[PDB]
Design a protein around this ligand. Structure first.
Ligand code: HEC
Length: 114
């Protein structure tokens, strides 16, 4: 949860994400507190879209497990909602971050991206 240390991890995310405009992935400013699949103008996968529709709001706590394995997280979320059929597809985000400390730190960074 060291946002400064998260800066170095965030450089990887900058391959596809910008704070304020969409790119390969959606704009991330204000992602902490945002309903999944709702960045204006971005076309999400059904998996991410359906997760937000089922109520997923990204928080400082749940983005951490998400980054370890985006597909597993979103599939598990929808399955827990009794919506496993809406989780058959995969996310467009083909990146994963195995290290837990790196995930905690980059999510602390995200929380400062207002
Ligand atoms: C390109 C190879 C990517 C990299 C590197 C990272 N992300 Fe990404 N991300 C990408 C796409 C194409 C998408 C849309 C997913 C879909 O299925 O539509 C995403 C999405 C996210 C989200 C969800 C945002 C939302 O509005 O619901 C988050 C929280 C996210 N990405 C975070 C994130 C971070 C912190 C990264 C560096 C650790 C990162 N992504 C890398 C593409 C790519």
């Amino acid at each position: 949860q060291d946002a400064k240390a998260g800066e170095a991890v965030f450089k990887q995310c900058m391959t596809c994400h910008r704070a304020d405009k969409n790119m390969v992935g959606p704009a991330l400013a204000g992602v902490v507190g945002r309903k999944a699949g709702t960045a204006a103008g971005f076309t999400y996968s059904p998996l991410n879209h359906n997760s937000g529709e089922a109520g997923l709001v990204w928080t400082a706590d749940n983005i951490v497990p998400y980054l370890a394995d985006p597909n597993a997280f979103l599939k598990k979320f929808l399955t827990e909602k009794g919506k496993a059929d809406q989780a058959v597809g995969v996310t467009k985000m083909t990146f994963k971050l195995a290290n837990e400390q790196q995930r905690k730190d980059v999510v602390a960074y995200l929380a400062t991206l207002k």
